[PDB]
Amino acid sequence: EQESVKEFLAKAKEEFLKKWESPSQNTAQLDHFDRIKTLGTGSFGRVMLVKHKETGNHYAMKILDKQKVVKLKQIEHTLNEKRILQAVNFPFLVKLEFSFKDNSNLYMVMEYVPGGEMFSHLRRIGRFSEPHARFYAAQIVLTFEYLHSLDLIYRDLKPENLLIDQQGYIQVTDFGFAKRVKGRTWTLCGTPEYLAPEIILSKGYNKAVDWWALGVLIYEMAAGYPPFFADQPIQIYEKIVSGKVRFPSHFSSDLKDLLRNLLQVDLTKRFGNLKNGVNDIKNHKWFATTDWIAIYQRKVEAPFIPKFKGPGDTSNFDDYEEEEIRVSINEKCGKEFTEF
């Protein structure tokens, strides 16, 4: 029912805004945790598996080096990622359990999502069948519906940021580039293959960029490679803005029609950006078999359930070089990160 969604999103905004205005802080400390293994990396640092000593529960702890964050001009992005993570609440968004800081680092302790990145499963299998791709895409559609209702643009959709949980469902991680923007914004950010043309062209843009990125994701899931690629980012950008795209011969007609409407250079024609908003995507023929409520309630049988031996199993993650975690005797960058 339309009225049910409206009431849900209104209650969701009220709760989001309460936490947005009074964020939590310093809900743990470092010696409560054993460090186990690096799980992955990004533009803001490393994420490690840790074990809570008191309980034995495992977590994924994002560690940010305050001096490095300041050197790289990431103060606002880092504070904002933590503010967002402590304020949102949605089945397909990774949950923040604790956050705290010390003399050297900021720490975001997330629920550990043990099934690995979508990225690795996709590269391993090659490509996902359309039903498999559609299962994941439906979760992203609902997640963007939620985020956009809060005026949040995500801006970094890609398989690397989509973690598979024990039920086979997605958890979106890494809000380092997300922004609360009612109108338009201008920052050049994202990952080259997934950038919408209006970003590349240095236009003011809005939440429509996430819908373009959905098109890129659906294409890459179903084809095994993204729609626009090349040796160098600049060459990727020329393809993106060209308004041309080619599809594998095994793509269904319904899939191609959806992708033509998501990978639409003209903002006045892009699905998700029209007067009917997300419903143009939800009602598209390619999603005809999708039970949106059952996806949200996680009652659909997942196409793929990852293997987990037990607490702290890391088999679904690649190995990375391990470094020490140093805490300095001197407080670094205290004023900069007061609000963390």
Binding site: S43, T191, P192
Partner: peptide, 18 residues
Amino acid sequence: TTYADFIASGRTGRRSAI
């Protein structure tokens, strides 16, 4: 093929934000 062209791009691994 397009797959071959993807391999030739060298961008088949994990991708960083700009």
